[PDB]
Amino acid sequence: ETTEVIEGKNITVERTGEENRRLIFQDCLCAVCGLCGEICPVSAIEVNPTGAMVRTEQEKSKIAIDENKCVLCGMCSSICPFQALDLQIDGTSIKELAEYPKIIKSAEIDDETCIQCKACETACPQDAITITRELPERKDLVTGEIEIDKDTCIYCGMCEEMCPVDAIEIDHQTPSSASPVVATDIRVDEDKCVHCGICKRICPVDAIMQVCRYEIKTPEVTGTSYIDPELCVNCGWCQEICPVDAATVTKPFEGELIIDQDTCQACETCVMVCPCNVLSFPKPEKPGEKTTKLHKDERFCIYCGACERSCPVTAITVKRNRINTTPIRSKAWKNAFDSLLK
Amino acid sequence: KDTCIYCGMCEEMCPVDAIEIDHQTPSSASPVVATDIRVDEDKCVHCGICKRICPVDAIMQVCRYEIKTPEVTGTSYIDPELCVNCGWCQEICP
Amino acid sequence: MRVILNTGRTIWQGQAIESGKDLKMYVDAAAIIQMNPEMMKQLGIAEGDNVKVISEYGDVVVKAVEAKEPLPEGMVYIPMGPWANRVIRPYTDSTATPSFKNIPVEIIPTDEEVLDMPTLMKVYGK
Amino acid sequence: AIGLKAYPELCHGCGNCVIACPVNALRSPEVAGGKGPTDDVEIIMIVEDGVVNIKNPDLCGKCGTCVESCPVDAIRLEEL
Amino acid sequence: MEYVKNVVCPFCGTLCDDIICKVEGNEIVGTINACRIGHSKFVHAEGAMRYKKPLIRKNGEFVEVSYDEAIDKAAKILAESKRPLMYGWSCTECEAQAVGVELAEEAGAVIDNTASVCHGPSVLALQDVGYPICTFGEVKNRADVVVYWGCNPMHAHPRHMSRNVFARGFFRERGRSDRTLIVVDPRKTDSAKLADIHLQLDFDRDYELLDAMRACLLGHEILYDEVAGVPREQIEEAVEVLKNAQFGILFFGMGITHSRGKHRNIDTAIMMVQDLNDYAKWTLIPMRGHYNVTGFNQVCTWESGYPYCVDFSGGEPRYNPGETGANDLLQNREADAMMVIASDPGAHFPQRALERMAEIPVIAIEPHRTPTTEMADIIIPPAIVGMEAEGTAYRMEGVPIRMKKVVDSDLLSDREILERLLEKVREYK
Ligand SMILES: Nc1nc2c(c(=O)[nH]1)N[C@H]1C(S)=C(S)[C@@H](COP(=O)(O)OP(=O)(O)OC[C@H]3O[C@@H](n4cnc5c(=O)[nH]c(N)nc54)[C@H](O)[C@@H]3O)O[C@H]1N2
Ligand SMILES: Nc1nc2c(c(=O)[nH]1)N[C@H]1C(S)=C(S)[C@@H](COP(=O)(O)OP(=O)(O)OC[C@H]3O[C@@H](n4cnc5c(=O)[nH]c(N)nc54)[C@H](O)[C@@H]3O)O[C@H]1N2
Ligand code: SF4
Ligand code: SF4
Ligand code: SF4
Ligand code: SF4
Ligand code: SF4
Ligand code: SF4
Ligand code: SF4
Ligand code: SF4
Ligand code: SF4
Ligand code: SF4
Ligand code: SF4
Ligand code: SF4
Ligand code: SF4
Ligand code: SF4
Ligand SMILES: [K+]
Ligand SMILES: [S]
Ligand SMILES: [W+6]
C-alpha cells in the first residue's frame, strides 16, 4: 500500500515491502516549473500556479501528489532541474544509481585562477556561492618609519587631532607643582599608522620624523570558493560575470525563448519567477527613449519553463530541443523524456 | 573604471573611507555587480594602500606658482575677573 | 496620557458622509479614535471602549479602535468631523486655515457615552 | 483548487487590481491606461457598485499581480 | 435600466469622467468604475434625509415653506448685514459659483470657498514662489518618479494611483513597474504600503526636512546628522532619486497644508521642485479635495482678480487671507450672517468658529441633513450637480470637465436659487 505524509510544506510518499521506496519533495527548492507533472506517467502530480506560489503567501505546497496513483517510478525526481524531488530506494537516492537516468549539469570554480573578487557570489540568483577572502593586515600595505622626539614635543596636541586614523595618543594631565607639565607621554601606534605625513607637517616644533620607505613575505590575498550543489541551478551567471574565466558551467537542457512584446503587459510576474535572472525591465537611458518591454539574456536560461507557465497572457513560450541525460535504459522512460521536447 | 573589476578591496581597506562603490544586484539588462567607483579627494590622505591591494592595477596613486601656505591661526583671552596672577601661564609657555 | 492628535480622511468616513451625516454609519466611522495596540494596553482599554479627549480648545468622547494604518509612537488619529473638531487647534496664524493636524491632547478612559450627530452639535447653544 | 477570491467588504474600489491585471490590460486599452472600461469588454473583474467584482474568473492565470497591488487584502489567491 | 456612460463623478478632485450609472426609473441604483466613495454619492442610502422642500426654523423645529418665501427671508438677511459671509461653493458647478460672486458684490459680502481650510496655504505659497504643474496625462505618459507628500490617496482619492501610477502610458508602458513611488507620511498609511520608499518623518517637521533636501540639492552639506527623524544619508539618497528622474511629479495634500508652517511648507516644496529642473524635469500637483473646489478659485480669480477670501465691502475687490477668510471672520466675530452653499462647516470648522455660527443667522443651500443644517435658520434643498444638474467643474490640475445631468429632479438648481436670491438682494437696497 502507498501512503503519504505532509510535514509542513513537504510531501513524502512511501511504499514498504521487500524494496522500500520514498519520494521526498522539498517545497523550498521547487521553482514551480511544472515539469514533474508533465512527465508523470500516471498523472499523479498537480502543480499549483507558478505566479501565485511566488508572489503571494500560500498555506499549501507548490505541488500535490496523489498517493493512489503514484507508483514510485521516480521519473519526476530524474527530470527535476532544481533538485526538489528525490526517490530513495532501500535508503539510497536514485542519483547514486547508474541504472537510473540523471540529467547532466555542472558548475565549478578553478581555485587557482579565482582572485576572490566576489562578483559571482553577488550575481548568483540562488545564493549558492560562498566566497571567503583574507586581506593582508593594513600595516603590511604601508612601509615607513616614524618617531616623535618627546623632548622637542611641546604637547600642543595638533598631531593627535589631525591623525586620520587615530594612531597618535597623548597622556594628558592637569599640572601640579610636583609635575608641572600638561602631558606625560606621546605614542604612535605603528599598527594603525598609514604614513601620510600629516603629523610631521602640522607639528609646530618639527618634533616628528616621518618618511616612507632580505626576504619579507610578499602580502597577498587568499580565499576559498564553494558552490552548493543543492542550490546551484546551472544558469551560468558565474561563468559570464567572472573577470578571469575561472567559473565553468554546463546546462541540462537546450532550447529557445520567444517573447511577444505586444502581448506582454509588463506585470513582472515572469521576471519575479525566473530562478536564473534571465528576464528584466530595462530602464531608458534618455528621456523619450523607448526600451524593449521584456528583455532576456538566454546565456542564463536553463529552459525550465517556469516563466511561460506563469504568464497569464501566454506572452512567453519556451522551446526545448534537447535534454542531456545519462543513459536512459528503458524505452518507455526515453519516450516520456522526449515528451518534454517542443 | 574600465580596468576596475569592482572586487571592493580598496573600499574595504581605505583607512579613511574615501572610496565609494555603487554596488548592485545584476540583471540581464545591467549585467554588472557595480555601476561606479569614486575617490573623495577631500578625505584621501594618499597612503597608497588602495593601489597596492588592487588585483588589476586599476588605480594610479602618487604623492607630489603661488599657493597659500597652510598655517595655524587662533586667539587668546585672559578673563581679568578670574585671573589670579599666579603665573602658571608664564612658566608653562614654551 | 498626553498624546499627539492627527486627523484626516478614511475611506469609511468618506462613504459615511455621502450616505448621510444623520446615519449611525457616520458616528461609527468619524466618532472614533484610532490607536496602536500597544497604546491601548498601557491605558487599559480594548476595542469598543470609549475615550475622553481633552485639549486646550475643548473636549469630546470617542470610541477607541485599533488602527489598521499604524501610527508612530505617541500619536492617535480621529477622522475629520464634528467630534474631531471639538479639540483641534482653531487658530489660523493669519492664513485663514485652522491647525487640524498634530495637536497635543490628553486621553483617558471613560464610561461616558458617545454623542450622536444632532446631540453633539447642541454643545454650541444655537 | 487555488483561484481568485474577493473580499468586497474590505475593498476601496480603488481600481489598482483592475489596471494591474495583464489579462484585463490585454483585452481593454482603456484598462491598460488606468481607466475603467467604457467599451463593453469581457475581463476578469471590475469595480461595480463601488467594490471589486469578479466577472470572468476562468480567464485568471493566478499570477498574483492584482494581489500585490492591493494594500488592504481585499483580493486574494487561495483555495476555494 | 438605462446605462449612462461617460459620467463625471461629483466627489473628489480626481474628477473621474468614466463613470457608468445604472438608472432604474429616474433613479441611480448602482454604478460601474466609481470607487466606494463615488458610488456612495451617486446612490441614495436608505434612511438618510434628503430635503424635499425648503425649511425655516421658528422654535427649534423647522417649518416647510416655498422657495420664494425662503429666498425672500435669506435675501432679507444678506441685504441688511454689514459683514456677510458667503462660504462653501466647492461641491457645485461653475455657473452657480459665478452668480455667487455677483451676489457677493451686490451684498458687500466676503466670498470664500473651502480652499481656506484646504489648499489655500498652497494658494498663498504659489502667489509668492510660483506654480510648476502638469496635467494627469503627462504624469501617466512620462512620469518615472511619483511622490505623494502628505496625502493618502487610497483613502481620499481612491482611483488616483490606478489612474496615474498603475496606468500604462506612452513612455511608461510597464505601468507601476516603470515608476519609483515615494510616500512621505508620519503614519504607515495604505498609500505608503504601496510605496517603494516611505519617508516616515516626524510630524510637523516637513519644513525642516525640505530645508535639508534643498540645501543638499544645491551642493551644501547637511548641518545635522538627522532631520525630521530622517538620517542624513537617507536624505541624500532621496535627493539623488529625484535628481535622476526623467520626469518627476510631486502630489501633495493636507499633511503639509494643515501642519506646522502651513503655506510655508508648500512654499519650500514648490521651490525644491523648481530647482530640481536644473537636474531633471519636475512638476507638482496639489491634491485638490472636492471635485470643484478648483473651479471656484478659477471663477473668482477671473471675475475679480483674486482666488478666495475676497472682500467686496469697499466695492473694489480686496484680498487678505488671515483677515478675509471664513474662519477669520467667524473666530474674530466679524461676520453677522453666514450663507453656506455646498459645504458643511458645522462638521468641518473648529469649535471656535462653530461658537460664532450659533450666534448669527445661518442660511444653508444643502440637500442632505448635516451638522450645518442643525445650526441653520433657513434650509434650501437644490438639485445635485453631476446627478440632477449640469455645469462645469475643474479637476485638481485645472482641466475643465462638464458635469452631467443623469436624472430629473423637481428641485431647483444652485444657479437658479442664487439668481433669484441675487434679484431679491438688489431689491432690498
Ligand atoms: N474619504 C474621504 N475622502 C475625501 C474627503 C473626505 O472627507 N473623505 N474629502 C476630500 C477633501 S475635501 C480633501 S482636501 C482631500 C484631502 O486628502 P488628503 O490630503 O489625503 O487629506 P488627509 O487624509 O486629511 O491627510 C493626508 C495625510 O496627511 C498626513 N499627515 C498628518 N500630519 C502630517 C505631517 O506633519 N506631515 C506629513 N507629511 N503628513 C502628515 C496624515 O497622516 C494623512 O494620512 O480628500 C478628499 N477626499
Ligand atoms: N479635523 C479636520 N477637519 C477638517 C479637515 C481635516 O483634515 N481634519 N479637512 C478640511 C477640509 S480639507 C475640507 S475641504 C472640509 C470639508 O469640506 P466640506 O465642504 O464641509 O465637505 P463635505 O462634508 O463633503 O461638504 C459638502 C456638502 O455639500 C453637499 N452637496 C453635495 N453636492 C451638492 C450640490 O450639488 N449642491 C449643493 N448645494 N450641495 C451639495 C453634501 O451633501 C455635503 O453635505 O473639512 C475640513 N475640516
Ligand atoms: S520539477 Fe519543477 S516543479 Fe516539479 S519539482 Fe522540480 S521543480 Fe518543483
Ligand atoms: S513517482 Fe513516478 S509517479 Fe510517483 S509521481 Fe513521481 S512520477 Fe508520477
Ligand atoms: S568571479 Fe571569478 S574570480 Fe571573482 S570570485 Fe567568482 S570566481 Fe573568483
Ligand atoms: S603619519 Fe599619518 S598616520 Fe601615521 S601618524 Fe602621522 S598622521 Fe597619523
Ligand atoms: S604636534 Fe609636534 S608637538 Fe604638538 S604634539 Fe604632536 S608633536 Fe608634540
Ligand atoms: S551557476 Fe547559476 S547558480 Fe549555479 S552558481 Fe554559478 S551561478 Fe549560482
Ligand atoms: S510576460 Fe507575461 S508575465 Fe512576463 S510580464 Fe509580460 S505579462 Fe507579465
Ligand atoms: S527564463 Fe529561462 S530560466 Fe528563467 S524561467 Fe523561463 S526558462 Fe526557466
Ligand atoms: S590613498 Fe590611501 S586613502 Fe587615498 S584612497 Fe587610496 S587608500 Fe584611501
Ligand atoms: S581594487 Fe582595484 S579593482 Fe577592486 S575595486 Fe578597488 S579598484 Fe576596482
Ligand atoms: S594662569 Fe594664573 S595667571 Fe596666567 S592666567 Fe590663569 S590665573 Fe591668571
Ligand atoms: S481590491 Fe484591493 S485593490 Fe482591487 S479594488 Fe478593492 S482595493 Fe483596490
Ligand atoms: S491574478 Fe494575475 S490574473 Fe488573475 S487576475 Fe489577479 S492578475 Fe489578472
Ligand atoms: S476618485 Fe474621487 S472621483 Fe474618481 S471616483 Fe473615486 S471619488 Fe469619484
Ligand atoms: K447618498
Ligand atoms: S477642499
Ligand atoms: W479639502
PDB file of C-alpha atoms in Angstrom, chain E residues 66-259:
ATOM      1  CA  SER E  66     -41.923  77.743  -0.636  1.00  0.00           C
ATOM      2  CA  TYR E  67     -38.723  78.651  -2.438  1.00  0.00           C
ATOM      3  CA  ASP E  68     -39.929  82.244  -2.781  1.00  0.00           C
ATOM      4  CA  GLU E  69     -40.527  82.754   0.940  1.00  0.00           C
ATOM      5  CA  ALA E  70     -37.265  81.072   1.978  1.00  0.00           C
ATOM      6  CA  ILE E  71     -35.300  83.014  -0.638  1.00  0.00           C
ATOM      7  CA  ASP E  72     -37.053  86.192   0.499  1.00  0.00           C
ATOM      8  CA  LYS E  73     -36.041  85.616   4.134  1.00  0.00           C
ATOM      9  CA  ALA E  74     -32.489  84.795   3.034  1.00  0.00           C
ATOM     10  CA  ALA E  75     -32.216  87.892   0.822  1.00  0.00           C
ATOM     11  CA  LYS E  76     -33.533  89.983   3.716  1.00  0.00           C
ATOM     12  CA  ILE E  77     -30.748  88.688   5.975  1.00  0.00           C
ATOM     13  CA  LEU E  78     -27.944  89.295   3.476  1.00  0.00           C
ATOM     14  CA  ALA E  79     -29.129  92.739   2.373  1.00  0.00           C
ATOM     15  CA  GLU E  80     -29.162  94.231   5.880  1.00  0.00           C
ATOM     16  CA  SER E  81     -25.894  92.645   7.016  1.00  0.00           C
ATOM     17  CA  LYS E  82     -22.778  94.782   7.306  1.00  0.00           C
ATOM     18  CA  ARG E  83     -20.296  91.883   7.062  1.00  0.00           C
ATOM     19  CA  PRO E  84     -21.996  88.853   5.496  1.00  0.00           C
ATOM     20  CA  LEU E  85     -20.022  85.698   4.749  1.00  0.00           C
ATOM     21  CA  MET E  86     -20.818  83.526   1.700  1.00  0.00           C
ATOM     22  CA  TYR E  87     -18.920  80.260   2.166  1.00  0.00           C
ATOM     23  CA  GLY E  88     -18.575  76.861   0.518  1.00  0.00           C
ATOM     24  CA  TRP E  89     -19.034  76.558  -3.243  1.00  0.00           C
ATOM     25  CA  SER E  90     -16.714  73.615  -3.797  1.00  0.00           C
ATOM     26  CA  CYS E  91     -19.414  70.961  -4.449  1.00  0.00           C
ATOM     27  CA  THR E  92     -21.399  72.874  -7.064  1.00  0.00           C
ATOM     28  CA  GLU E  93     -20.795  73.852 -10.674  1.00  0.00           C
ATOM     29  CA  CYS E  94     -19.106  76.962 -12.002  1.00  0.00           C
ATOM     30  CA  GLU E  95     -22.143  78.914 -13.213  1.00  0.00           C
ATOM     31  CA  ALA E  96     -23.654  78.766  -9.734  1.00  0.00           C
ATOM     32  CA  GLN E  97     -20.247  79.888  -8.454  1.00  0.00           C
ATOM     33  CA  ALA E  98     -20.269  82.838 -10.869  1.00  0.00           C
ATOM     34  CA  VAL E  99     -23.696  84.046  -9.743  1.00  0.00           C
ATOM     35  CA  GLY E 100     -22.314  83.800  -6.221  1.00  0.00           C
ATOM     36  CA  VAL E 101     -19.589  86.319  -6.996  1.00  0.00           C
ATOM     37  CA  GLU E 102     -22.077  88.835  -8.445  1.00  0.00           C
ATOM     38  CA  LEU E 103     -24.246  88.307  -5.376  1.00  0.00           C
ATOM     39  CA  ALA E 104     -21.209  88.843  -3.136  1.00  0.00           C
ATOM     40  CA  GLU E 105     -20.519  92.171  -4.860  1.00  0.00           C
ATOM     41  CA  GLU E 106     -24.147  93.249  -4.555  1.00  0.00           C
ATOM     42  CA  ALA E 107     -24.320  92.301  -0.870  1.00  0.00           C
ATOM     43  CA  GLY E 108     -20.901  93.718   0.018  1.00  0.00           C
ATOM     44  CA  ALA E 109     -20.019  90.255   1.242  1.00  0.00           C
ATOM     45  CA  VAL E 110     -16.884  88.255   1.803  1.00  0.00           C
ATOM     46  CA  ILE E 111     -16.955  85.296  -0.610  1.00  0.00           C
ATOM     47  CA  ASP E 112     -14.749  82.339   0.294  1.00  0.00           C
ATOM     48  CA  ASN E 113     -14.621  78.644  -0.580  1.00  0.00           C
ATOM     49  CA  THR E 114     -13.255  75.541   1.123  1.00  0.00           C
ATOM     50  CA  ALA E 115      -9.720  76.371  -0.057  1.00  0.00           C
ATOM     51  CA  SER E 116      -9.340  78.440   3.125  1.00  0.00           C
ATOM     52  CA  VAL E 117      -9.361  75.180   5.108  1.00  0.00           C
ATOM     53  CA  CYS E 118      -7.568  73.127   2.426  1.00  0.00           C
ATOM     54  CA  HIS E 119      -5.103  74.249  -0.263  1.00  0.00           C
ATOM     55  CA  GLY E 120      -5.458  77.942   0.493  1.00  0.00           C
ATOM     56  CA  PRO E 121      -1.991  77.574   2.022  1.00  0.00           C
ATOM     57  CA  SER E 122      -0.906  76.249  -1.369  1.00  0.00           C
ATOM     58  CA  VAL E 123      -2.545  79.270  -2.988  1.00  0.00           C
ATOM     59  CA  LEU E 124      -0.598  81.599  -0.676  1.00  0.00           C
ATOM     60  CA  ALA E 125       2.600  79.650  -1.402  1.00  0.00           C
ATOM     61  CA  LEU E 126       2.174  79.796  -5.199  1.00  0.00           C
ATOM     62  CA  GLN E 127       1.435  83.539  -5.080  1.00  0.00           C
ATOM     63  CA  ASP E 128       4.876  84.028  -3.512  1.00  0.00           C
ATOM     64  CA  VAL E 129       7.067  81.491  -5.377  1.00  0.00           C
ATOM     65  CA  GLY E 130       5.143  80.098  -8.394  1.00  0.00           C
ATOM     66  CA  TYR E 131       3.252  77.056  -9.628  1.00  0.00           C
ATOM     67  CA  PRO E 132       5.032  74.469 -11.819  1.00  0.00           C
ATOM     68  CA  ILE E 133       2.403  71.844 -12.772  1.00  0.00           C
ATOM     69  CA  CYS E 134       1.234  69.464 -15.489  1.00  0.00           C
ATOM     70  CA  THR E 135      -1.955  67.581 -16.323  1.00  0.00           C
ATOM     71  CA  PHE E 136      -2.736  63.977 -15.426  1.00  0.00           C
ATOM     72  CA  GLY E 137      -1.968  62.655 -18.900  1.00  0.00           C
ATOM     73  CA  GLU E 138       1.617  63.904 -18.647  1.00  0.00           C
ATOM     74  CA  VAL E 139       2.121  62.013 -15.380  1.00  0.00           C
ATOM     75  CA  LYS E 140       0.563  58.935 -16.982  1.00  0.00           C
ATOM     76  CA  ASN E 141       2.718  59.011 -20.124  1.00  0.00           C
ATOM     77  CA  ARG E 142       6.058  60.420 -18.819  1.00  0.00           C
ATOM     78  CA  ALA E 143       6.491  60.099 -15.034  1.00  0.00           C
ATOM     79  CA  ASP E 144       9.063  57.686 -13.598  1.00  0.00           C
ATOM     80  CA  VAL E 145       9.165  59.191 -10.083  1.00  0.00           C
ATOM     81  CA  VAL E 146       5.804  59.788  -8.401  1.00  0.00           C
ATOM     82  CA  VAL E 147       5.643  61.325  -4.928  1.00  0.00           C
ATOM     83  CA  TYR E 148       2.657  61.533  -2.606  1.00  0.00           C
ATOM     84  CA  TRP E 149       3.700  64.060   0.045  1.00  0.00           C
ATOM     85  CA  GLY E 150       1.317  64.352   2.960  1.00  0.00           C
ATOM     86  CA  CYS E 151      -1.614  62.776   1.135  1.00  0.00           C
ATOM     87  CA  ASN E 152      -3.341  59.391   1.438  1.00  0.00           C
ATOM     88  CA  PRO E 153      -4.883  58.779  -1.999  1.00  0.00           C
ATOM     89  CA  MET E 154      -6.030  55.229  -1.164  1.00  0.00           C
ATOM     90  CA  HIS E 155      -8.478  56.816   1.313  1.00  0.00           C
ATOM     91  CA  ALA E 156      -9.107  60.286  -0.146  1.00  0.00           C
ATOM     92  CA  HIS E 157      -8.557  59.968  -3.926  1.00  0.00           C
ATOM     93  CA  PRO E 158      -9.092  56.243  -4.290  1.00  0.00           C
ATOM     94  CA  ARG E 159      -8.659  55.867  -8.076  1.00  0.00           C
ATOM     95  CA  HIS E 160      -5.807  58.388  -8.286  1.00  0.00           C
ATOM     96  CA  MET E 161      -2.987  55.812  -8.134  1.00  0.00           C
ATOM     97  CA  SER E 162      -4.654  53.391 -10.547  1.00  0.00           C
ATOM     98  CA  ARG E 163      -5.237  56.244 -12.984  1.00  0.00           C
ATOM     99  CA  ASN E 164      -1.727  57.771 -12.653  1.00  0.00           C
ATOM    100  CA  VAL E 165       0.692  55.074 -11.363  1.00  0.00           C
ATOM    101  CA  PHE E 166      -0.537  51.590 -12.291  1.00  0.00           C
ATOM    102  CA  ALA E 167      -1.747  53.018 -15.605  1.00  0.00           C
ATOM    103  CA  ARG E 168       0.466  52.283 -18.594  1.00  0.00           C
ATOM    104  CA  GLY E 169       1.474  55.303 -20.648  1.00  0.00           C
ATOM    105  CA  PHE E 170       3.234  56.046 -23.885  1.00  0.00           C
ATOM    106  CA  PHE E 171       6.775  56.344 -22.470  1.00  0.00           C
ATOM    107  CA  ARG E 172       5.827  54.271 -19.380  1.00  0.00           C
ATOM    108  CA  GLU E 173       4.337  51.163 -20.920  1.00  0.00           C
ATOM    109  CA  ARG E 174       5.137  48.989 -17.875  1.00  0.00           C
ATOM    110  CA  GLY E 175       2.825  50.963 -15.590  1.00  0.00           C
ATOM    111  CA  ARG E 176       3.680  50.501 -11.933  1.00  0.00           C
ATOM    112  CA  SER E 177       6.966  48.756 -12.765  1.00  0.00           C
ATOM    113  CA  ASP E 178       8.246  51.877 -14.608  1.00  0.00           C
ATOM    114  CA  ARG E 179       7.764  54.252 -11.651  1.00  0.00           C
ATOM    115  CA  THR E 180       9.537  54.858  -8.358  1.00  0.00           C
ATOM    116  CA  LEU E 181       6.781  55.501  -5.811  1.00  0.00           C
ATOM    117  CA  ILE E 182       7.555  57.698  -2.780  1.00  0.00           C
ATOM    118  CA  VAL E 183       5.172  58.485   0.079  1.00  0.00           C
ATOM    119  CA  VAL E 184       6.032  60.965   2.848  1.00  0.00           C
ATOM    120  CA  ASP E 185       3.796  60.486   5.900  1.00  0.00           C
ATOM    121  CA  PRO E 186       4.351  60.040   9.677  1.00  0.00           C
ATOM    122  CA  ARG E 187       1.842  57.144   9.503  1.00  0.00           C
ATOM    123  CA  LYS E 188       2.087  53.775   7.727  1.00  0.00           C
ATOM    124  CA  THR E 189      -0.885  54.553   5.507  1.00  0.00           C
ATOM    125  CA  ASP E 190      -2.411  52.206   2.970  1.00  0.00           C
ATOM    126  CA  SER E 191      -0.869  54.543   0.393  1.00  0.00           C
ATOM    127  CA  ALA E 192       2.584  54.224   1.974  1.00  0.00           C
ATOM    128  CA  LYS E 193       2.129  50.434   1.936  1.00  0.00           C
ATOM    129  CA  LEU E 194       2.305  50.514  -1.873  1.00  0.00           C
ATOM    130  CA  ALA E 195       5.389  52.750  -1.999  1.00  0.00           C
ATOM    131  CA  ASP E 196       8.951  51.888  -2.946  1.00  0.00           C
ATOM    132  CA  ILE E 197      10.230  54.490  -0.453  1.00  0.00           C
ATOM    133  CA  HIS E 198       8.274  55.566   2.628  1.00  0.00           C
ATOM    134  CA  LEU E 199       9.707  58.596   4.422  1.00  0.00           C
ATOM    135  CA  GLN E 200       8.063  58.169   7.809  1.00  0.00           C
ATOM    136  CA  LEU E 201       9.193  61.539   9.084  1.00  0.00           C
ATOM    137  CA  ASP E 202       8.461  63.283  12.371  1.00  0.00           C
ATOM    138  CA  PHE E 203       5.176  65.205  12.289  1.00  0.00           C
ATOM    139  CA  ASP E 204       5.301  68.989  11.830  1.00  0.00           C
ATOM    140  CA  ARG E 205       8.935  68.786  10.609  1.00  0.00           C
ATOM    141  CA  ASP E 206       8.451  68.713   6.806  1.00  0.00           C
ATOM    142  CA  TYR E 207       9.745  72.265   6.511  1.00  0.00           C
ATOM    143  CA  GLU E 208      12.945  71.274   8.294  1.00  0.00           C
ATOM    144  CA  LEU E 209      13.289  68.165   6.142  1.00  0.00           C
ATOM    145  CA  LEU E 210      12.792  70.103   2.907  1.00  0.00           C
ATOM    146  CA  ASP E 211      15.349  72.667   4.051  1.00  0.00           C
ATOM    147  CA  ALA E 212      17.919  69.866   4.219  1.00  0.00           C
ATOM    148  CA  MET E 213      16.874  68.417   0.866  1.00  0.00           C
ATOM    149  CA  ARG E 214      17.084  71.803  -0.850  1.00  0.00           C
ATOM    150  CA  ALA E 215      20.481  72.564   0.680  1.00  0.00           C
ATOM    151  CA  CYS E 216      21.819  69.132  -0.286  1.00  0.00           C
ATOM    152  CA  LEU E 217      20.447  69.680  -3.804  1.00  0.00           C
ATOM    153  CA  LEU E 218      22.400  72.948  -4.168  1.00  0.00           C
ATOM    154  CA  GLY E 219      25.598  71.172  -3.104  1.00  0.00           C
ATOM    155  CA  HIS E 220      25.667  72.023   0.615  1.00  0.00           C
ATOM    156  CA  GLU E 221      26.444  69.608   3.429  1.00  0.00           C
ATOM    157  CA  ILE E 222      23.594  68.974   5.849  1.00  0.00           C
ATOM    158  CA  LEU E 223      24.336  70.574   9.225  1.00  0.00           C
ATOM    159  CA  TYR E 224      22.585  67.949  11.388  1.00  0.00           C
ATOM    160  CA  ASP E 225      23.046  64.187  11.142  1.00  0.00           C
ATOM    161  CA  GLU E 226      19.271  63.582  11.366  1.00  0.00           C
ATOM    162  CA  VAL E 227      16.449  65.860  10.184  1.00  0.00           C
ATOM    163  CA  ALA E 228      12.750  65.273  10.890  1.00  0.00           C
ATOM    164  CA  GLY E 229      13.738  61.856  12.179  1.00  0.00           C
ATOM    165  CA  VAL E 230      15.294  61.009   8.798  1.00  0.00           C
ATOM    166  CA  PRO E 231      19.020  60.103   8.814  1.00  0.00           C
ATOM    167  CA  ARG E 232      21.369  62.357   6.847  1.00  0.00           C
ATOM    168  CA  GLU E 233      22.422  59.554   4.499  1.00  0.00           C
ATOM    169  CA  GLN E 234      18.787  58.728   3.712  1.00  0.00           C
ATOM    170  CA  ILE E 235      18.066  62.364   2.876  1.00  0.00           C
ATOM    171  CA  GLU E 236      20.951  62.491   0.406  1.00  0.00           C
ATOM    172  CA  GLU E 237      19.780  59.224  -1.169  1.00  0.00           C
ATOM    173  CA  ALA E 238      16.258  60.624  -1.549  1.00  0.00           C
ATOM    174  CA  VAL E 239      17.576  63.768  -3.234  1.00  0.00           C
ATOM    175  CA  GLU E 240      19.592  61.596  -5.656  1.00  0.00           C
ATOM    176  CA  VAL E 241      16.430  59.694  -6.631  1.00  0.00           C
ATOM    177  CA  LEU E 242      14.770  62.996  -7.540  1.00  0.00           C
ATOM    178  CA  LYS E 243      17.795  64.274  -9.484  1.00  0.00           C
ATOM    179  CA  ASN E 244      17.897  61.139 -11.652  1.00  0.00           C
ATOM    180  CA  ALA E 245      14.225  61.233 -12.660  1.00  0.00           C
ATOM    181  CA  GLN E 246      13.347  61.679 -16.307  1.00  0.00           C
ATOM    182  CA  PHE E 247      10.014  63.174 -15.246  1.00  0.00           C
ATOM    183  CA  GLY E 248       9.014  63.644 -11.610  1.00  0.00           C
ATOM    184  CA  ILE E 249       5.640  64.608 -10.172  1.00  0.00           C
ATOM    185  CA  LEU E 250       5.039  65.795  -6.617  1.00  0.00           C
ATOM    186  CA  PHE E 251       1.492  65.264  -5.413  1.00  0.00           C
ATOM    187  CA  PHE E 252       0.797  66.798  -2.020  1.00  0.00           C
ATOM    188  CA  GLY E 253      -2.101  67.340   0.392  1.00  0.00           C
ATOM    189  CA  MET E 254      -3.295  68.210   3.899  1.00  0.00           C
ATOM    190  CA  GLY E 255      -0.299  66.726   5.679  1.00  0.00           C
ATOM    191  CA  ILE E 256       1.588  69.939   4.820  1.00  0.00           C
ATOM    192  CA  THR E 257      -1.232  72.485   4.409  1.00  0.00           C
ATOM    193  CA  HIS E 258      -2.718  71.816   7.873  1.00  0.00           C
ATOM    194  CA  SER E 259       0.538  71.086   9.752  1.00  0.00           C
TER     195      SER E 259
END
